[PDB]
Design a protein around this ligand. Structure first.
Ligand SMILES: *[C@]1(N)Oc2ccccc2C(O)S1
Ligand SMILES: *[C@]1(N)Oc2ccccc2C(O)S1
Ligand SMILES: *[C@]1(N)Oc2ccccc2C(O)S1
Ligand SMILES: *[C@]1(N)Oc2ccccc2C(O)S1
Lengths: 257, 257, 256, 258
């Protein structure tokens, strides 16, 4: 017994975001890896050095490749992290017990890889972004845009139910990121590989960054093997409701054996 | 009469370490700045780029110069942050209401600047470092050495009285640092006229195993302070295991003399 | 190939003062930045907003901060611009190939930061200032004084050997400045480890009547210089009366 | 005794632009005032504080107000400066020997005050502006637009015949201004009785690429002038590329219009 939980943070965050969850999963006798994606957390890479979703996901790809033949894992993707899980599932489908999407963007091998992002962008008026910074770092021929959450956006849309301490922590650690729309519109997931992995979506009822209605929409339109929900949780469930999240994850681990 | 508290982290940490304290001071109606020093927290610089204490303190020096004309601050330095405070005190003595040393290294204006650090290493057994890594990144004629706390040293000497969540956060954010001994041993950066003119306050953390209470008292007895406060039961990371008491202490000294 | 020259104007002037030199340096294949310091040239800040030498030097500090990872520059400071140079040298010592002080005030890390200015003020008789305006805008708690060159001081002491067009240009562009005496007398801007680790070069202007050749020589002897070059026949505004020689001199010390 | 020349710069420029011409006129024994209009040159006001041509021309109006009345002047307006000249001619017509429009915008009393600006734009392609910046700074119910020449625009449309030194100088001194289209379209300023009672001289710069010769001749032909002078081989910045030719022309008008 004892599974391996691979936790993948969202945009503008890093492995640190799982600091309240990690200890809980370990106490239950499980292995946990809360990695930093490229240019995230304490990774020295710069966001301008990332031109594709792959570059950004590289760290996860390297970890998945180091996994022992008999060391299956439970991938947990938060927010944009869901897109990162897609590449891992497409390349290492049989190394995944189940893919868990925590208030994340969950892709599929049916629509265009950027579909869920495009739908989100359309149902999201510019004002909702508040003080988020969107800046170009590519070229008119090869357009690249970076996304960097501002303090207002973090407090009103992502941490409205989190403690003032959690907000202070995030405000001193958030770094520029990117939705990698342009890159994702050029294609990356197939039925045979990506579509063979069980998907479990965890809904955060009070989520304002990625509203509950949009999460439901993804469950209905994209489809999942199972849908769970953490009532009273905002976008940052691993911070405002770590124990509930842990319980859910452990239940997933027991079920998808 | 709101106050501007400038919080300065210790070696291997960053502004994020003050995430529990910051909200408490602000709730009390004060302004707080928890900056990242060079190659710390999310700062993109690498430790190998820092050769002196000044290079490392650069972010603090920039903050001091950005201060309004008639705007003073209360400096709070933790651990190695005490040395950073020394440089700011020597350069902008009139811009500081008081310099608070929290379980920190506190220099003097009599011996060379590396004095207390040499005294610390000489009164503290090598075995106390546990898994901390000391690596050279300079040359035989221009020596440079980086210091990186390992998981054992962090859990056994710094966070022994902190929660498992706090230890998890530190393990995912810690980065290599340096005591900059080489640089500091070759000069006397502090003078009684500037550095020594700044009001000094020391906060002793009785259960500290990183910088033992005995050494803290020794530093106090080496130069003297305007006031010595004590936080009984706090380990090296007082802002994490005793944020409320620390906040109260800072609010008190914020009107003592 | 080709270097980046950062030109820093003196008191009451601005980036425009390098309009004759800038083209020459670029013609040689070099990048030139003739920035405006705070409350100078077309900058919108007012003199009463600058309380310290750092506030005045802010634009130079931002420029240095925006420099590429492995991008170095050659600083050229004129007149008061030398003091601005010192701050840049102290903060970014390793991004500077050499600091050129063109008939400028050049500090050291030994005495007070205002040392050379205090010495200058003690040799310079009140008569020499002519119609220059000195007005206070601070308080005894922190004394502040603005300095504004008058048309006569400009014509007799700074532009006596310059063309009538250049004098007209200056008269329509000069703005109040400050020597920041009091701020400097209590600050510790320069240290031997940083400011003093940067190669120093001094270009003396023989016919200078603003900062006389003797005072220029004194500063050179006071702290020492890696190389001291001289532009014979140039008044205080060497980039206006002798731009070509200045360019040649700068391209020479650009490696020698 | 020598006359008083009041030099009025164009948009994004300042008194400094007349630095080569000023000495020439003074050498001739004449008095010269190269003032800075509002938010121009070293003026501390910002373009966002100006919403009408009148606010922008304030400095000129203040200067005209201090004239002894027994002391007349010769107004020389360059580029957009010609519009500033109009307000002075309207308010102090009897204190002006003549108004000189150097490759400027010369208004009339018949059409809307923005007439010449509207015409200019109608025969000027949106690409002639190059890297020039047009930013809005007026509230939704009170539209206001700022104009800021870019380096390319200066080098290829205004200073194509000037020295590299003058381009370097202009680039380090240009500031944002405005054509004040909004204000000029609803505010009637000039009248035939006053503005029109002043003699107008237009100096054409044949090589002008900012305000092309054709439009300059268009204004002379449509708006009318007392006399038309021409400076062959000069770009938009005649006071920089041909200061001596311009000075001779000004001294000439200063003599026949006394
Ligand atoms: C994730 N961490 O949070 C949000 C919130 C709102 C919109 C996008 C995103 C991400 O891409 S990541
Ligand atoms: C500080 N953060 O913690 C410790 C602990 C033990 C020895 C040195 C140090 C520092 O320099 S920093
Ligand atoms: C410099 N531009 O010119 C002079 C001349 C005489 C005395 C002081 C100064 C400056 O501070 S700046
Ligand atoms: C004048 N200085 O230059 C130009 C050039 C082209 C179009 C307009 C204008 C001005 O309004 S001012």
């Amino acid at each position: 017994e004892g599974k391996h939980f691979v936790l993948v943070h969202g945009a503008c965050h890093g492995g640190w975001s799982w600091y309240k969850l990690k200890p809980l999963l370990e106490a239950a006798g499980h292995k946990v890896t809360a990695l930093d994606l490229a240019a995230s957390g304490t990774d020295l890479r710069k966001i301008e050095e990332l031109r594709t979703l792959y570059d950004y996901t590289l760290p996860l790809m390297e970890l998945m490749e180091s996994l022992s033949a008999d060391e299956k894992v439970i991938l947990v993707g938060h927010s944009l992290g869901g897109m990162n899980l897609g590449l891992a599932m497409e390349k290492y489908p049989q190394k995944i017990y189940a893919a868990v999407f925590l208030a994340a963007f969950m892709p599929d091998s049916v629509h265009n890889s950027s579909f869920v992002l495009e739908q989100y962008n359309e149902r999201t008026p510019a004002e909702n972004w508040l003080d988020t910074q969107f800046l170009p770092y590519g070229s008119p021929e090869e357009p690249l845009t970076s996304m960097f959450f501002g303090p207002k956006f973090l407090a009103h849309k992502l941490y409205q139910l989190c403690s003032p301490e959690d907000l202070a922590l995030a405000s001193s650690l958030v770094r520029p990121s990117s939705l990698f729309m342009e890159d994702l519109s050029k294609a990356y997931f197939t039925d045979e590989r990506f579509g063979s992995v069980k998907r479990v979506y965890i809904v955060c009822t009070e989520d304002k960054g990625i509203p509950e209605e949009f999460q439901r929409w993804q469950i209905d339109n994209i489809g999942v093997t199972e849908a769970i929900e953490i009532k009273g949780a905002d976008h940052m469930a691993m911070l405002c409701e770590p124990q509930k999240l842990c319980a859910s994850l452990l239940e997933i681990a027991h079920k998808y054996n």
